[PDB]
């Protein structure tokens, strides 16, 4: 299937070269898979979700996304126009307040919730968790991420926007999950993107158009943008039966576009998420 004039990020992950504008993907589109977006929540009523999105858990007074960050990421995962896996089921877990803030204990609680909750859902093709958040290193946060991944959920996390080594950040520094770096439309590492040996892969993260609250849309940047591209791609590949939750990150790295990125520090992988679609 093909989406013409698609956001540059979608086009990029379905091409071996930059500069294209069509997003090629298999019609299955992640149907049968589920993706938990652990963020500020999701405006589930947004037309772009077609009813495929719903809040399942909040750690605050409301389950409503009063920020927009979570709705933006969820849209990149599976909104009809801005998403990678256009048919996947989205579940929102509000672990961040409407200012985009959250305490480590709440974030950890959110991760354990998903590990257990996935057992109450019907996701025959597999479960993914997208975590576009992070802070300073913490062995407890890293550990919570490792548990979620271990329970059978494909965990994708943002590398961070400090233009530094992601070793000092969590859950970015947990080796067992999928740490996502950010790239721009000209195949350059995003200027704010963290790097380092712990990164597993890069995804489009600069000037990403997606859904926003109030039923709108807007373009923003960050490794938080990149992470849902990979979470969505994983759900897409799992639905296709190409990989499983335990090996998705590795499969994505093996089949990525190699050496296409510039301004990648020595010691950091030069790999860009790619769906390898062939019609």
């Amino acid at each position: 299937a093909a989406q013409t004039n698609a956001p540059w990020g979608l086009a990029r992950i379905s091409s071996t070269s930059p500069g294209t504008s069509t997003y090629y993907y298999d019609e299955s589109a992640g149907q049968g898979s589920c993706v938990y977006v652990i963020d500020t929540g999701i405006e589930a009523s947004h037309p772009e979700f077609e009813g495929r999105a719903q809040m399942v858990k909040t750690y605050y007074y409301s389950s409503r996304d009063g920020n927009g960050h979570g709705t933006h990421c969820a849209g990149t995962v599976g909104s009809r126009t801005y998403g990678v896996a256009k048919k996947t089921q989205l579940f929102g877990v509000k672990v961040l307040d409407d200012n985009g803030s959250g305490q480590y204990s709440t974030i950890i609680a959110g991760m354990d919730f998903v590990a257990s909750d996935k057992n109450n859902r019907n996701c025959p093709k597999g479960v993914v968790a997208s975590l576009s958040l992070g802070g300073g290193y913490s062995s407890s946060v890293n550990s919570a991420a490792a548990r979620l991944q271990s329970s059978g959920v494909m965990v994708a996390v943002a590398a961070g926007n400090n233009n530094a080594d992601a070793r000092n950040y969590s859950p970015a520094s947990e080796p067992s999950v999928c740490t996502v770096g950010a790239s721009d439309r000209y195949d350059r590492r995003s200027s704010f993107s963290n790097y380092g040996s712990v990164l597993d892969i890069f995804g489009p993260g600069t000037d990403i158009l997606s859904t926003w609250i109030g039923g709108s849309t807007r373009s923003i940047s960050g490794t938080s943008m990149a992470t849902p591209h990979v979470a969505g791609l994983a759900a897409y590949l799992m639905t296709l039966g190409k990989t499983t939750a335990a090996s998705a990150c590795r499969y994505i790295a093996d089949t990525a576009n190699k050496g296409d990125l510039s301004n990648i520090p020595f010691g950091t992988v030069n790999l860009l998420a790619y769906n390898n679609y062939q019609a």
Partner: peptide
């Protein structure tokens, strides 16, 4: 948190 979402970028 400890990351982002603030809305005037860098």
């Amino acid at each position: 948190k400890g990351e982002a979402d603030a809305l005037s970028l860098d």
